[PDB]
Design a protein around this ligand. Structure first.
Ligand SMILES: [K+]
Ligand SMILES: [K+]
Ligand SMILES: [K+]
Ligand SMILES: [K+]
Ligand SMILES: [K+]
Ligand SMILES: [K+]
Ligand SMILES: [K+]
Ligand SMILES: [Mg+2]
Ligand SMILES: [Mg+2]
Ligand SMILES: [Mg+2]
Ligand SMILES: [Mg+2]
Ligand SMILES: [Mg+2]
Ligand SMILES: [Mg+2]
Ligand SMILES: [Mg+2]
Ligand SMILES: [Mg+2]
Ligand SMILES: [Mg+2]
Ligand SMILES: [Mg+2]
Ligand SMILES: [Mg+2]
Ligand SMILES: [Mg+2]
Ligand SMILES: [Mg+2]
Ligand SMILES: [Mg+2]
Ligand SMILES: [Mg+2]
Ligand SMILES: [Mg+2]
Ligand SMILES: [Mg+2]
Ligand SMILES: [Mg+2]
Lengths: 132, 205, 243, 177, 111, 184
RNA sequence: CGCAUGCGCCCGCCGUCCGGCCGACCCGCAGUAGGGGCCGGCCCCCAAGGGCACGUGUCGUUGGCUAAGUCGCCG
RNA sequence: GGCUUGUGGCAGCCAAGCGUUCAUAGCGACGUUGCUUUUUGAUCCUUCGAUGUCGGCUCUUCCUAUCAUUGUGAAGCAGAA
RNA sequence: UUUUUGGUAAGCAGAACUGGCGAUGCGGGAUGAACCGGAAGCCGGGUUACGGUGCCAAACUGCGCGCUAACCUAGAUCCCACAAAGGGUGUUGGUCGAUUAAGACAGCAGC
């Protein structure tokens, strides 16, 4: 039993190319290798499945819907909120945030991590002597 | 293939389910760039085409011998580790000093003998069978091929590997329990660390 | 062009090179397969070729021309005085074959065996195994010896005993330096093999404990030497014409 | 945006003469990689079909034809003539693409693969947009399903860019459909 | 805590000397091919263009009370598509340096 | 031409415990338990509830051919643990009677006097297969078991052990042949 | 594994002096037409793209004290 | 020795006919497609400041287009051959 | 290369037009007087030709579609170092015709 299928309404992540990190909706299927995808901020176009990673989100739309119909369907299902709140979608956001930290911000994060590690190690020691 | 370019004292590669030729070409380039490589579990290397074709190829290799003096080569090594070593030798200018030094930086073993049993082992995606061989196509393990051409240590490696895996499972459970004991520690430390967690929150996965 | 007439080649290519053997004592290249269900028993023995004679016996071979008839057949006499066990060695099965783990020797070693460790026994100080023999004299040393034996019981897969001949008992040989070899122990578990070997330390094992009457055995040794030889005698090629 | 093959309408005629001051005007719909090669193939057919060579002909107009709805999916039928190693043959092919330019690109790629036919050994007789109910090839019919549904059996594992490429990794790829 | 003894600050990245600019049948020692750790594309190479390079090695004799020797160079242009770069040094690097490491400094700085 | 979806389904009886995991099917019934390894098939097995569904996605004609093969094998396992399999063999001879000796708890058979030969032919039944001489019929063997492959393969071993050689097999029809392929 | 040279040799220290490192930190197994974690339903995966580490001082200033914690050395 | 393969040698395709009946168990006329360099020719590229020119004897190794031996299929294979 | 005579044919013999080698290195064709590129004072930089970019070995295991599975040493690049007639219910495309919800085909059943 497979968990994800290519179908009309499936939300997919572009895993390769310039559009990497963007969410698109499969609105029609051309052949085995290509699908017709549409997003609120892009023109409807075809792309190969080799550049797509299917997600668990799936909106309820008809084949090749209008942009207004597509936009409201995504908002109704909270596609953006679900993806960003999910662990998979948060990974992409965190990677961008880490790369965007300046020198001063990295120094602050170092101090927080160093202090966090020191306290955690002390807590573990108590859990060792007591809960041997 | 230009090379990994990483700075490491030593690289330990687990060759399980790696394609022989693609693993050889990548490792040959790493060796030529001055990288020291250790390969373990060479008996689990995979060769495309199936056992029958690979067995026939090795039998043709066994035919080659200096008619007037067979001891003068070619030498037909049967063990999986030596077959991998000879495969890499064909991708290196081993008759030059530069090539000879590159080969001297390579170590190959069947199984995982000490001390490498307690050292992190990496994989090479460009040589992995799961990415390079389409499911349903014929392939054979180098250990299986070596046994049929005169390698008699397959059972010995198999028993030692089972013993190592069981010990690794016990060690894995100890770390698994230790991890469960550490999630409690951070929760207890949560009260003390109020400002610190706020800074790490946007960065935590 | 093809050779005019066909005959088999002279000599065997399976006995090459035809060089002088690198040993004087016959080496056992392979020991009998071990059967754990059988009692511990030695697999080999050393002897000395005394000479040949002939015997007469009445054959019992149904369906043979010799049935109930007498036949004269040559026999060889091999003098086999009992051997003395002086040590035990254990091997571990590894991906690179059998590897020697440890060697444990008996407390007392005869002069004849000690001669095997020297090129000039008389001129030497005869220090062999003197320090080794001392640790049998202390409780801590005895514990160490027993610890080594337990180590063999735990890891060893093949057990062989160190045995030497009592060459002094055959004055005709004119030799005092005894011959030492490893004799594999077959039968029983590894623990039984170690206990079997350690129990015979400094004791004698008669030839009857290894072989018996009417059984087939293999004889290993070095053939008679004959020096530099030509192809006709060495390989059996036919002689060329007189002219 | 960018197509390997472009569709052009090429219009030409024989040079006016005293006998014929208004010679017939011929038009063709030709596929080529650019305008220059479209003109060359136009005179090839006029020379061999209407006996009008470029040396005694006149080029009137050349215009590129663009897909009307490049965002929707259409079924395209292509009637073609090609030369094999032993003669000439006619065949009909169907394709699904957003533009007829893509469908023609698929046709050339397929002919090269399944028949070892080079580009210059193919003549396109006719092209058309076939409605779903009038398609003939099963490779096109099976995607005429309102409830089209299937998994991605084969996936290509790779970093989004070569910046995240490393020779060594601590664990093997984790893949599941 | 480790208790290590060594350089306390690292302001350079390591680069591997791959060889010289060459063809299948000719070699040009005046240019060296260097792989910089962490650089995997031609686009990423643009940041390192003009950066100073140092090939540090040990000689048998002592000069200025040290066995260390340094040959200076810089990154000139990218090589290929996989982040390899072409480098020039005050003197052509010896073939012995193949497989050795060089220090890619962060100066001169354009940022 | 890769079909998007090829699927076939079969009905699981009520008194069968079928367990499927990673193309490893285990069937348990009143007669016993049978297990077969289908990891060599690039198919998708699924239990829906009882029915067994096998699907092939974007598979060539060769790949889809294994869908029915997998179902037939599973059906054989179900019949093996419910009804069993019974293969009957008949001795054929013209002059020399064929003497059979069952031994080892019906797990072995020895054939003597085949075409007058003094050689004794010994065949050992495969796991879970028992051979018994029938009494109702003259010169008949009965092989019983749960796995059809083992029972059928055991009969093949007996048949091929008694091949006539250096003779015209058209006239020298001596041998042991399978006469019925049924179930208990 | 045995025995190992008295004006010699082997070890444990202390100094004298001689010929590539820069955090050179990291042990689950197995599968990939799947594998886990929780209550058939819900979650996790979708590359170490991670985690760990005073990671902060002229290879690192002087003089103290030093709770536990981490780390090195030593029977 | 090299190129060539007419000639020599070996092999295949079509099926008129032979085979009591019956194209193809076994054969293959009329045609037609090849292989081989263990025949002989054709050529004159190497060697004429020299590669010792018949056969046998002796000795090793290699080939298969398999004479015998091992395992099998076919028959106008009852058995034997 | 092309036109072309003798010859079964030849890395054979003899002509026609041009180029080439010989007298000439250099890059490619693994290797080669003639093939492909291209002709050259001694150097630095840039860019290419032919040919290439898994390792040997400078440059992608780059981005796309399909075909092939070789239990014959599957196959792998002008000259070029070979293969034919004839066959395959191997597999992939195409062309013509016939049959089929009024019930075909296979099996089953009594046309
Ligand atoms: K001869
Ligand atoms: K003799
Ligand atoms: K003679
Ligand atoms: K510090
Ligand atoms: K011929
Ligand atoms: K001459
Ligand atoms: K075909
Ligand atoms: Mg390279
Ligand atoms: Mg002969
Ligand atoms: Mg041996
Ligand atoms: Mg003598
Ligand atoms: Mg007969
Ligand atoms: Mg002829
Ligand atoms: Mg004929
Ligand atoms: Mg001469
Ligand atoms: Mg001479
Ligand atoms: Mg000579
Ligand atoms: Mg043959
Ligand atoms: Mg007859
Ligand atoms: Mg001439
Ligand atoms: Mg001249
Ligand atoms: Mg060539
Ligand atoms: Mg230049
Ligand atoms: Mg590729
Ligand atoms: Mg053909």
């Amino acid at each position: 039993p497979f968990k994800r299928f290519v179908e009309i309404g499936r939300v997919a992540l572009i895993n390769y190319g310039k559009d990497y990190g963007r969410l698109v909706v499969i609105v029609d299927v051309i052949d085995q290798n290509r699908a017709l995808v549409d997003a609120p901020d892009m023109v409807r176009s075809q792309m190969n499945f080799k550049r797509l990673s299917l997600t668990d989100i799936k909106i309820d739309i008809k084949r090749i819907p209008k942009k207004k119909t597509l936009v409201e369907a995504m908002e109704a299902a909270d596609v953006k909120t679900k993806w960003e709140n999910s662990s998979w979608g948060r990974k992409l956001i965190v990677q961008k945030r880490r790369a965007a930290l300046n020198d001063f911000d990295r120094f602050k994060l170092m101090l927080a991590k160093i202090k966090r590690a020191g306290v955690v190690r002390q807590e573990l020691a108590k859990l060792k002597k007591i809960a041997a | 293939v230009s090379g990994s370019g990483i700075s490491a004292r030593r690289i330990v590669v687990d060759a399980r389910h790696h394609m022989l030729g693609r693993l050889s070409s990548i490792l040959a380039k790493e060796l030529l760039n001055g990288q020291r490589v250790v390969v373990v579990r060479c008996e689990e290397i995979c060769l495309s085409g199936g056992l029958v074709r690979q067995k026939m190829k090795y039998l043709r290799f066994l035919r080659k011998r200096m008619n007037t003096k067979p001891s003068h080569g070619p030498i037909h090594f049967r063990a999986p580790s030596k077959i991998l070593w000879r495969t890499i030798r064909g991708m290196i200018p081993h008759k030059t000093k530069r090539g000879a030094a590159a080969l001297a930086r390579l170590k190959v073993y069947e199984g995982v003998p000490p001390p490498y049993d307690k050292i992190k082992r990496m994989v090479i995606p460009d040589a992995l069978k799961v990415l390079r061989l389409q499911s349903g196509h014929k392939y054979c393990l180098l250990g299986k091929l070596s046994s049929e051409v005169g390698w008699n240590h397959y059972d010995t490696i198999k028993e030692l590997e089972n013993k190592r895996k069981e010990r690794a499972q016990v060690a894995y459970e100890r770390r698994k329990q230790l991890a469960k004991l550490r999630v409690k520690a951070e929760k207890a430390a949560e009260e003390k660390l109020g400002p610190q967690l706020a800074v790490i929150e946007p960065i935590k996965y | 062009s093809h050779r005019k007439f066909e005959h088999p080649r002279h000599g065997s290519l399976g006995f090459l090179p035809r060089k002088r053997a690198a040993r004087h004592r016959g080496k056992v290249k392979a020991f009998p397969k071990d059967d754990p269900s059988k009692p511990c028993k030695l697999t080999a023995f050393l002897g000395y070729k005394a000479g040949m004679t002939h015997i007469v016996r009445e054959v019992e071979k149904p369906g043979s021309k010799l049935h109930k008839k007498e036949t004269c057949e040559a026999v060889t006499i091999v003098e086999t005085p009992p051997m003395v066990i002086v040590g035990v060695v254990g091997y571990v099965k590894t991906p690179r074959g059998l590897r020697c783990l440890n060697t444990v020797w008996a407390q007392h070693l005869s002069e004849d065996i000690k001669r095997r460790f020297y090129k000039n026994w008389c001129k030497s100080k005869k220090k062999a195994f003197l320090k080794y023999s001392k640790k049998y004299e202390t409780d801590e040393g005895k514990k160490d010896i027993q610890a080594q034996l337990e180590k063999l019981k735990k890891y060893a897969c093949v057990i062989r005993v160190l045995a030497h001949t009592q060459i002094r008992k055959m004055k005709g040989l004119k030799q005092k330096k005894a011959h030492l070899m490893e004799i594999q122990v077959n039968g029983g578990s590894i623990a039984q093999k170690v206990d079997f070997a350690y129990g015979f330390f400094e004791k004698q094992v008669p030839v009857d404990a290894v072989f018996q009457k009417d059984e087939m055995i293999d004889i290993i040794g070095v053939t008679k030497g004959k020096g530099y030889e030509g192809v006709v005698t060495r390989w059996g090629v036919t002689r060329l014409p007189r002219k | 945006v960018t197509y390997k093959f472009h569709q052009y309408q090429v219009v030409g005629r024989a040079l006016p003469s005293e006998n014929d001051e208004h010679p017939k005007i011929y038009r063709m719909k030709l596929w080529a990689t650019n305008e220059v090669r479209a003109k060359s193939k136009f005179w090839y057919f006029l020379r061999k079909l209407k006996k009008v060579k470029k040396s005694n002909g006149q080029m009137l107009a050349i215009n590129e034809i663009f897909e009307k709805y490049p965002t929707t999916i259409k079924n395209y039928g292509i009637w073609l003539r090609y030369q094999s190693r032993t003669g000439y043959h006619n065949m009909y092919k169907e394709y699904r693409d957003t533009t007829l330019n893509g469908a023609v690109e698929q046709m050339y790629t397929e002919m090269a693969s399944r028949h070892r036919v080079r580009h210059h050994c193919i003549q396109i007789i006719k092209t058309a947009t076939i409605p779903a109910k009038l398609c003939k090839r099963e490779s096109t019919k099976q995607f005429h399903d309102s409830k089209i549904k299937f998994p991605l059996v084969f996936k290509k594992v790779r970093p989004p860019s070569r910046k995240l490429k490393t020779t060594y990794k601590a664990t093997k790829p984790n893949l599941f459909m | 805590v480790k208790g290590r003894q060594g350089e306390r600050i690292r302001l350079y990245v390591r680069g591997t000397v791959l060889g010289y600019k060459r063809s299948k049948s000719n070699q040009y020692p005046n240019t060296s091919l260097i792989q910089i750790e962490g650089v995997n594309t031609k686009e990423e190479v643009d940041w390192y263009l003009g950066k100073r390079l140092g090939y540090i090695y040990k000689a048998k004799t002592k000069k200025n009370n040290s066995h260390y020797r340094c040959i200076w160079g810089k990154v000139c242009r990218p090589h290929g598509n996989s982040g390899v770069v072409r480098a020039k040094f005050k003197s052509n690097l010896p073939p012995k340096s193949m497989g050795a490491k060089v220090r890619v400094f962060m100066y001169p700085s354009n940022i | 031409m890769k079909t998007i979806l090829s699927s076939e389904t079969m009905d699981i009886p009520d008194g069968i415990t079928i367990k499927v995991k990673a193309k490893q099917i285990e069937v348990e019934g009143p007669r016993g338990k049978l297990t077969r390894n289908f990891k060599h098939l690039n198919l998708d097995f699924q239990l829906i509830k009882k029915k067994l569904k096998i699907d092939a996605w974007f598979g060539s004609r060769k790949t889809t051919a294994a869908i029915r093969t997998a179902l037939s094998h599973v059906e054989n396992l179900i019949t093996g643990v419910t009804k069993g399999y019974r293969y009957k063999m008949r001795f054929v001879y013209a002059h020399f009677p064929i003497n059979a000796s069952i031994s080892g708890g019906n797990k072995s058979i020895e054939i003597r006097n085949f075409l007058g030969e003094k050689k004794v032919r010994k065949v050992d039944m495969l796991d879970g297969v028992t051979v018994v001489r029938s009494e109702k019929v003259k010169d008949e063997l009965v092989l019983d078991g749960n796995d059809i492959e083992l029972v059928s393969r055991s009969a093949a071993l007996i048949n091929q052990k008694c091949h006539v050689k250096n003779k015209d097999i058209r006239k020298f029809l001596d041998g042991i042949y399978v006469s019925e392929k049924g179930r208990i």
